[PDB]
């Protein structure tokens with residue numbers, strides 16, 4: 001169990017003005033810190049944010065959150081469930097800003113909702129320093145789905161924040177799970193354009209300077225923002241991601257046209273990861289992995305994801321028998337026998 005703390009700075013809020021927060025299970029004898037960003041799509045105008053407030057309210061408000069959460073997968077403290085970082089300090093940051101962790105806009109006079117995801121991350125880090133993060137030696141910012149994209153948008157800002165607060169020794173790293181999407185041709189972009197204006201969304205400065213005014217939406221796509229990043233980032237992406245296929249209007253007797261479409265999507269995803277040295281990409285139809293209890297089961301080329309992450313740690317201190325770049329080459333879903341059932 002991780003226990004809830006609402007933010008002491010109550011001006012940093014969820015969508016409806018209620019305080020944001022974080023769940024914490026500390027580990028005294030450890031100097032490693034894992035901050036996990038929850039996912040859950042997003043909303044981009046008044047009417048579809050209102051819809052989300054009726055039937056997905058816990059993603060927009062803290063008024064109904066429980067006092068405790070169970071840590072699962074990489075947030076588990078048990079070595080059998082979490083061979084990678086079972087002894088670490090564990091933090092789960094709930095997603096209640098509906099802005100892919102990019103917003104910096106208060107509730108107001110002219111704003112029905114607050115979109116403060118980027119400021120929520122910054123405030124959690126600030127308040128955690130007084131609870132032991134000041135002694136840390138590695139801070140891993142991780143996340144799944146919209147939280148995975150949020151890692152890409154925020155990892156360098158967290159590094160910059162700690163450097164300016166006087167903590168140059170804390171090594172900030174990123175782990176982006178299922179947040180690496182393609183702006184490809186559909187089988188049969190305005191939502192994100194149109195949300196960044198609604199959220200006052202912020203993107204990393206170097207990527208902003210490449211694409212410039214009005215084109216910041218480009219920085220929500222992994223293969224375009226990752227080359228501008230400076231912190232080390234490990235990328236986990238299923239080759240046949242279910243969220244990707246949904247937006248592409250694919251619904252799984254597959255005939256030639258769809259066969260080529262699916263095979264092409266795989267090969268395109270594979271291509272965008274060829275120059276990503278730390279990555280894990282199985283040939284499976286799925287979505288998210290790192291906080292699932294059975295995340296230890298999947299393997300690429302004989303290496304599991306917890307092992308690949310351990311090899312990543314060793315690389316940041318070629319390694320014999322301990323690889324870090326693991327991308328499937330077989331071209332159809334399920335062609336890896338270890339895929340989730």
Ligand SMILES: CC(=O)Nc1ccc(Nc2ccccc2)cc1
Nearest residue numbers: 181182183184185189243244247
């Ligand atoms: C031609 C063109 O613009 N294609 C395109 C653009 C944006 C998306 N957006 C998206 C992808 C995956 C997951 C969530 C959103 C998908 C396809």
Ligand SMILES: *[C@@H]1O[C@H](CO)[C@@H](O)[C@H](O)[C@H]1NC(C)=O
Nearest residue numbers: 008009010011012119122123
């Ligand atoms: C609380 O957060 C807001 C928004 O980030 C900031 O402007 C304000 O200075 C913060 N208050 C304190 C006491 O840090």
